[PDB]
Enzyme design. Structure first.
Site, short mmCIF file in Angstrom:
data_model
loop_
_atom_site.label_atom_id
_atom_site.label_comp_id
_atom_site.label_asym_id
_atom_site.label_seq_id
_atom_site.Cartn_x
_atom_site.Cartn_y
_atom_site.Cartn_z
N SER C 147 40.01 50.16 35.78
CA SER C 147 39.61 50.36 37.17
C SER C 147 40.84 50.42 38.06
O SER C 147 41.87 49.86 37.70
CB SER C 147 38.72 49.22 37.65
OG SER C 147 38.45 49.33 39.04
N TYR C 167 36.93 39.93 38.48
CA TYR C 167 36.78 41.33 38.10
C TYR C 167 38.11 42.06 38.20
O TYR C 167 38.58 42.63 37.24
CB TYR C 167 35.75 42.05 38.97
CG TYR C 167 35.62 43.52 38.62
CD1 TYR C 167 34.89 43.92 37.51
CD2 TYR C 167 36.25 44.50 39.39
CE1 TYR C 167 34.78 45.27 37.18
CE2 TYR C 167 36.14 45.84 39.06
CZ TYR C 167 35.41 46.22 37.95
OH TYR C 167 35.30 47.55 37.62
N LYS C 171 40.56 43.50 35.08
CA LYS C 171 40.94 44.90 34.91
C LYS C 171 42.46 45.04 34.79
O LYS C 171 42.98 45.89 34.06
CB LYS C 171 40.36 45.74 36.04
CG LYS C 171 38.84 45.87 35.96
CD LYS C 171 38.43 46.52 34.64
CE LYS C 171 36.93 46.80 34.60
NZ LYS C 171 36.54 47.52 33.34
N1 LIG Z 1 30.54 51.38 38.87
C1 LIG Z 1 31.76 51.60 39.35
O1 LIG Z 1 31.96 52.05 40.67
C2 LIG Z 1 32.98 51.39 38.50
C3 LIG Z 1 34.22 51.67 39.07
C4 LIG Z 1 35.38 51.48 38.34
C5 LIG Z 1 35.27 51.04 37.03
N2 LIG Z 1 34.05 50.76 36.47
C6 LIG Z 1 34.02 50.29 35.06
O2 LIG Z 1 33.36 51.25 34.25
C7 LIG Z 1 32.62 50.59 33.22
C8 LIG Z 1 31.14 50.97 33.30
O3 LIG Z 1 30.66 50.74 34.60
P1 LIG Z 1 29.11 50.95 35.01
O4 LIG Z 1 29.01 50.85 36.49
O5 LIG Z 1 28.60 52.15 34.30
O6 LIG Z 1 28.43 49.65 34.36
P2 LIG Z 1 26.87 49.27 34.34
O7 LIG Z 1 26.09 50.35 35.11
O8 LIG Z 1 26.90 47.90 34.90
O9 LIG Z 1 26.66 49.30 32.75
C9 LIG Z 1 27.58 48.58 31.96
C10 LIG Z 1 27.09 48.59 30.53
O10 LIG Z 1 27.84 47.72 29.71
C11 LIG Z 1 27.02 47.14 28.70
N3 LIG Z 1 27.39 45.75 28.45
C12 LIG Z 1 27.58 44.71 29.33
N4 LIG Z 1 27.89 43.61 28.61
C13 LIG Z 1 27.89 43.94 27.29
C14 LIG Z 1 28.12 43.23 26.12
N5 LIG Z 1 28.35 41.92 26.14
N6 LIG Z 1 28.03 43.90 24.92
C15 LIG Z 1 27.70 45.24 24.86
N7 LIG Z 1 27.48 45.93 26.02
C16 LIG Z 1 27.57 45.28 27.19
C17 LIG Z 1 25.63 47.07 29.23
O11 LIG Z 1 24.67 47.37 28.24
P3 LIG Z 1 23.12 47.24 28.57
O12 LIG Z 1 22.81 48.61 29.13
O13 LIG Z 1 22.28 47.12 27.29
O14 LIG Z 1 22.81 46.25 29.63
C18 LIG Z 1 25.71 48.02 30.40
O15 LIG Z 1 25.12 49.20 30.04
C19 LIG Z 1 32.87 49.09 33.40
O16 LIG Z 1 33.98 48.67 32.62
C20 LIG Z 1 33.24 49.00 34.87
O17 LIG Z 1 33.97 47.84 35.19
C21 LIG Z 1 32.89 50.93 37.18
#
Ligand SMILES: NC(=O)c1ccc[n+]([C@@H]2O[C@H](COP(=O)([O-])OP(=O)(O)OC[C@H]3O[C@@H](n4cnc5c(N)ncnc54)[C@H](OP(=O)(O)O)[C@@H]3O)[C@@H](O)[C@H]2O)c1
Ligand SMILES: NC(=O)c1ccc[n+]([C@@H]2O[C@H](COP(=O)([O-])OP(=O)(O)OC[C@H]3O[C@@H](n4cnc5c(N)ncnc54)[C@H](OP(=O)(O)O)[C@@H]3O)[C@@H](O)[C@H]2O)c1
Ligand SMILES: NC(=O)c1ccc[n+]([C@@H]2O[C@H](COP(=O)([O-])OP(=O)(O)OC[C@H]3O[C@@H](n4cnc5c(N)ncnc54)[C@H](OP(=O)(O)O)[C@@H]3O)[C@@H](O)[C@H]2O)c1
Ligand SMILES: NC(=O)c1ccc[n+]([C@@H]2O[C@H](COP(=O)([O-])OP(=O)(O)OC[C@H]3O[C@@H](n4cnc5c(N)ncnc54)[C@H](OP(=O)(O)O)[C@@H]3O)[C@@H](O)[C@H]2O)c1
Ligand code: NI
Ligand code: NI
Lengths: 260, 260, 260, 260
Positions: C147, C167, C171
């Site tokens: 991130s 968080y 990262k």
């Molecule tokens: N959203 C943003 O604006 C943003 C920005 C920058 C970076 N990111 C990074 O991008 C990545 C994905 O973000 P997102 O927003 O798509 O996340 P999300 O919508 O919160 O989905 C995250 C997924 O990770 C899986 N997960 C969580 N804990 C787990 C575990 N212990 N074992 C296996 N799977 C696990 C979950 O599976 P389940 O579906 O079964 O619950 C969930 O689907 C993350 O690393 C996040 O920090 C996100």
């Protein structure tokens, strides 16, 4: 008891120190017990200001008219300074300029202006002093005044840049230059480091656009512009013998602006 | 004349302050006049060492056995320190550990071992003190010992890593954590900064693989590991009132290693 | 003519590949011709979603319930993926979580929750795949979703932090871990890189405080949050043979946020 | 299936596109289907080389003798290119030079030389093109060839610097300049990014002592210099519509050098 740094009988060269931040460095080092040279460009009242400074802290001060962008003029001023106050112990390359115009309007002349002082000058002063110390086998510590602008582009308004791409980029060059020099001179017990201030209060500030100035103040965690006084502590440390393991580094005094 | 920083009638907490770099911080602040509270984990001679420091610099010192990874022990220890030597003026969260193993072999236990101290321990220590300062409407400065490892991976041989990925990554986390805390506590007059050392000579060094030690020294511009005393100057400045515009920053003492 | 990257007959593993940014990754590599192994934690429709991807893009897919914070389940899952869809050509270690609370209120439990997934989970997943590659003497590429938060603290309002220090720090750890792993696995033909998104619109976005959302988009040069699809090009590049000289790096997709 | 980027019906300008890394870019974008405008300084065979590229990939190409450090010539050349192959879809500002000499021996002439091309030359080219795009309300993408030298100082021997402080410092300026330009032109649909190579095997690099190159390669995790083609994937991505959320960034293709 107390942590004490003393520069008594030591001379520190300080460019652009007849005013602005340079003047802060001037007093600070002097107050710590140092003889000080104020290089200036054309300040009508520079010789005065210097004198006043030296009489206030009981130290040896002398000003010098000198365009740091000029090789020979700088190579002489340094030779001279080393005859009026040598041997040199430390240097603070702070002289800097800037142009504010949309990037599409910047001309070669603008580039030359900015880079001759903000980058070539810094190099010029360092090389001059270094050659000297090298010649006589003198150790030394150099503090180059950069800016946090070496890392970020400033704003003049929300999501709006303060247009001075040559300034910011010259500061990046500046901070990198510090590493290049430290690299070659480290073996000669010579240290080079960069001090990079954030938004600082200076006379010009009270005459800048207020909508801008305020905006610039709106995203600073400390909620205020610095005082030039808040930049000298890090310089003294860098020059002092407590910093024997500090070289090639960049030390920010940004008030937390770089957090965001 | 001179530059002075005095911690007379002020208390400084130092975790892992009973040996290594931490002891250097302890002695340095003790020499600046502060009373010192040394937090340790299990060193058999921590109490003796701390007592001696107090006798050597004529200041009040006390050692506290306190696992920084434990929430309640830390909270209780901070309260006791405030009662024994309050008010607390500053904190150096220095306690840290590492695990050296090829990455493929690292376990979850190794992860917890490193992160609970290097990151959670830092957070926990900082939070306890910050909460006290917030409750008592007191200002304060915090210095966290990170490492140049926050930026680079160390070598054990030419083009060969010193295998400790949890260590380097925990330090990157630590330096970022400093920004996060600095952002939330800025308005409360609480400053937080990271001090990041390069290679330092400690008691462990004399017992390491000579070949690895020699290799690491062979690529540092200053050509040698640092002595722990070389880390103290920057710490003192950061804790002092001169550093009023310094927060969320990371200050390297790498002897030029980051140049390459 | 044109620039084409084909993953036909290659298998990519995507953790958290069933929704959000992870699903965008899954769909992109599938469209590029890759078979996809989707790892998830508990989503009740993970299997259906994964099956649909395979049908839509005419590739083989399978979902695996596998908590990335657990060593043995990950080891077993990677082995099963290899048996079902091997050889494994690439990995996107994307699963991640967060906890939003004022720093003073964060607990050891919150720390464990975030770090076990965001750092240990990434390490564990990377390690399991790398061990298999090393054992079978296979080459591969790994992309970790970090991130822009690895460099800065996010804002929830003007000069106001989006309080989630674990968080952002997790990262930063992640992006450094990428360097550490890349350092050890370089000679075995295994590359590791971090892909660091800026603000992205996901399902949760539409249900978040609108004021916060507006503030966050107001200081992004491109004036908007990214769509998940905008993160995929860099990932595909990093996973491909065009990226043979790319390892240990962090590739930002921030819309210019880091400029400020 | 597959990931495909097509530039068929697009024109890319590449400065220094007749040899070295620039020629790799030329061939890479031509293979992707782009017409190419190759800018060079004085190469005697640039026309032949450029023509051969066009015939090999069945695209329209043309060479233009144009000193990037000259304002008017660049402006005129851009106008001619637009007339000849416009609208211009992208720009790769790649032209660059260096001076290897001990820092104490460097001159102002050397400064002007390096900076006129590596910094002003880049600014001049980007500005000439940007003004055109703005005047015609055209969107576009710009890639600038910087260097990993923007972050570090190269070595010629163990703990020994590759003395060219003006080179490294100009590249730091360059990468910052990219942020500056990106900041001003973001609202105009114009993206600007830096691509920063590690050690690359070009005729120019091959001119320095093999002893030096052997030393350099011995400390790169990938254990070799890159081939110029290894720089092209990232450039194509940056110039493409897949990179819509990528601006102001610096993308390293360093073989892991920055890990250490
Ligand atoms: N959203 C943003 O604006 C943003 C920005 C920058 C970076 N990111 C990074 O991008 C990545 C994905 O973000 P997102 O927003 O798509 O996340 P999300 O919508 O919160 O989905 C995250 C997924 O990770 C899986 N997960 C969580 N804990 C787990 C575990 N212990 N074992 C296996 N799977 C696990 C979950 O599976 P389940 O579906 O079964 O619950 C969930 O689907 C993350 O690393 C996040 O920090 C996100
Ligand atoms: N102000 C800020 O918020 C801020 C922030 C970050 C960094 N900085 C840096 O800190 C330094 C001082 O800032 P400031 O605002 O005090 O600047 P200032 O008020 O504009 O003072 C700059 C001084 O440099 C001297 N100077 C200009 N051109 C010169 C040349 N060619 N040769 C020798 N001296 C020359 C001038 O001396 P004369 O008076 O005799 O003409 C002038 O006093 C600069 O490097 C600046 O970039 C400032
Ligand atoms: N050595 C280096 O070259 C180097 C370089 C850069 C940064 N650093 C960092 O600087 C700091 C100190 O380094 P050092 O070399 O002096 O370390 P050291 O010689 O290993 O001493 C570290 C001290 O931390 C204390 N400690 C460890 N875990 C603790 C816990 N759970 N609770 C309370 N205290 C705990 C220990 O107390 P006990 O004495 O009771 O065991 C130990 O004295 C660390 O953060 C380290 O990562 C070291
Ligand atoms: N080679 C490496 O290991 C390496 C590593 C990192 C970064 N880089 C950077 O990548 C770029 C190209 O590297 P290279 O090794 O291919 O360099 P090169 O072989 O030296 O090619 C540079 C080209 O730029 C052109 N050029 C120089 N000055 C010019 C001017 N004033 N106006 C227009 N064109 C000019 C030249 O055209 P003419 O042919 O007509 O002379 C020359 O072909 C440079 O920016 C360099 O700094 C190279
Ligand atoms: Ni920022
Ligand atoms: Ni490095």
């Amino acid at each position: 008891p107390g942590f004490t740094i003393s520069f008594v009988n030591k001379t520190i060269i300080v460019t652009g120190g007849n005013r602005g931040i340079g003047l802060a460095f001037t007093r600070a080092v002097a107050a710590a017990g140092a003889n000080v040279a104020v290089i200036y460009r054309s300040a009508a009242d520079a010789v005065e200001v210097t004198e006043k400074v030296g009489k206030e802290f009981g130290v040896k001060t002398k000003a010098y008219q000198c365009d740091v962008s000029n090789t020979d003029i700088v190579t002489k001023t340094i030779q001279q300074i080393d005859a009026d106050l040598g041997p040199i112990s430390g240097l603070i390359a702070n002289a800097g300029v800037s142009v504010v115009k949309p990037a599409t309007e910047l001309t070669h002349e603008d580039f030359a202006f900015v880079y001759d002082v903000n980058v070539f000058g810094v190099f010029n002063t360092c090389r001059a002093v270094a050659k000297l110390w090298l010649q006589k086998q003198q150790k030394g510590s150099i503090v180059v005044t950069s800016s946090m602008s070496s890392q970020i582009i400033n704003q003049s308004s929300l999501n709006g840049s303060l247009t001075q791409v040559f300034y910011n980029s010259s500061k990046a060059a500046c901070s990198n230059l510090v590493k290049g020099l430290a690299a070659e001179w480290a073996s000669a017990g010579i240290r080079v480091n960069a001090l990079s201030p954030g938004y600082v209060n200076t006379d010009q500030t009270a005459h800048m656009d207020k909508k801008i100035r305020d905006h610039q103040a709106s995203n600073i965690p400390l909620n205020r512009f610095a005082q030039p006084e808040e930049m000298t502590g890090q310089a003294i440390l860098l020059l002092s013998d407590h910093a024997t393991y500090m070289t090639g580094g960049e030390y920010f005094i940004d008030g937390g602006q770089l957090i965001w």
